């Protein structure tokens, strides 16, 4: 979750 995960992919 979080911004960490948003580095690898940003959710639909």
């Amino acid at each position, epitope marked *: *979750t979080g911004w*960490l*995960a*948003g*580095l*690898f*992919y*940003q*959710h*639909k």
Partner: antibody
Amino acid sequence: GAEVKKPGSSVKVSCEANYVITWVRQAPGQGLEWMGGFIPDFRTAMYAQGFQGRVTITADLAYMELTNLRSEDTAVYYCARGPLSRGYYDYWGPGTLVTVS
Amino acid sequence: YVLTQPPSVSVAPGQTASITCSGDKLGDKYVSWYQQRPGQSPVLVLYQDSKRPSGIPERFSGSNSGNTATLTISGTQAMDEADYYCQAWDSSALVFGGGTKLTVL
């Protein structure tokens, strides 16, 4: 581009370290399987599931190291690169065949 | 998280091929597609369900709904022979479909 490792040995696959680095392997007859990822600007490494904890992701070049090789680890290993925050990889490096026996 | 694809599709030159990729509420995720010609590194042919990188012709197109994403290739050429893999992210894990082997003959 093709290497032969003995059982129980180790292999390191290195990749050039705004982009996301990902390591993928293609085992004969098993499609592609993620091994983990690395984001150079944030130094964040994600680990994939299913390698019994024998993957290490490090950077000085970033490196994916797989220890305690067995015949099931025979596969083509790729570096791949993609844009930050976009979950896809638009550049795949040349594969490296690793033959364990 | 599991993504399933048909293992093989076999089509004559010129006709349209569809390759499906299914997973639990996959329609709610961005799906990317890769073309791997035999003996070669994969190439990105679709991202974000339906967008084509530069160099990928408009005869490649994609859709994504319910539990299935679909890659559609019209006017199939011999050079389209390849393994096609869908990918998606679930819970900070990257997942690949099992790949579909496309034969043009």
